């Protein structure tokens, strides 16, 4: 139980983070050229929220893998000096820091 309660805390904190705006919604491949071809396993906070609210996370490690997937995809598709890349570096450092601040 305590494993999944922290997942809720950190996802809520990521959802309300100032830098979360690229990650709240699944990328629309119709509007983002090349996204379908380049990113094999899309992930975003709303997709993690759906899975967490339906109980679909077995452990905290499945949850973190989805979180790290958001930021791996971000760095794969976006330049580090792009607006989205900069937002994702902020969010990745937040997650890694807060996740270690617990375990
Ligand atoms: C910033 C923004 O609003 N995006 C977005 C775009 C959509 O069409 C639908 C939903 C979202 C969340 C984009 C997210 N991107 C990521 C995560 O690489 C992007 C990478 C490149 C361009 C936009 C985004
Ligand atoms: Mg480190």
């Amino acid at each position: 139980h305590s494993d999944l309660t922290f997942c809720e805390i950190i996802l809520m904190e990521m959802e309300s983070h100032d830098a979360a705006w690229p990650f709240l919604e699944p990328v629309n491949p119709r509007l983002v050229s090349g996204y379908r071809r380049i990113i094999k396993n899309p992930m975003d906070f709303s997709t993690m929220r759906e899975r967490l609210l339906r109980g679909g996370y077995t452990s905290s490690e499945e949850f973190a893998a989805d979180a790290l997937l958001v930021f791996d995809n971000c760095q794969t598709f976006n330049e580090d000096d792009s607006e989205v890349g900069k937002a994702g570096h902020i969010m990745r450092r937040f997650f890694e820091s807060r996740w270690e601040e617990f375990y």
Side-chain angles (χ1 to χ4, degrees), residues 21-29 31-32 35 73-74 77-78 84:
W21 54 273
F23 316 110
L24 300 167
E25 273 198 315
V27 178
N28 188 336
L31 303 170
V32 185
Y35 200 79
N73 291 342
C74 183
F77 193 79
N78 304 285
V84 168

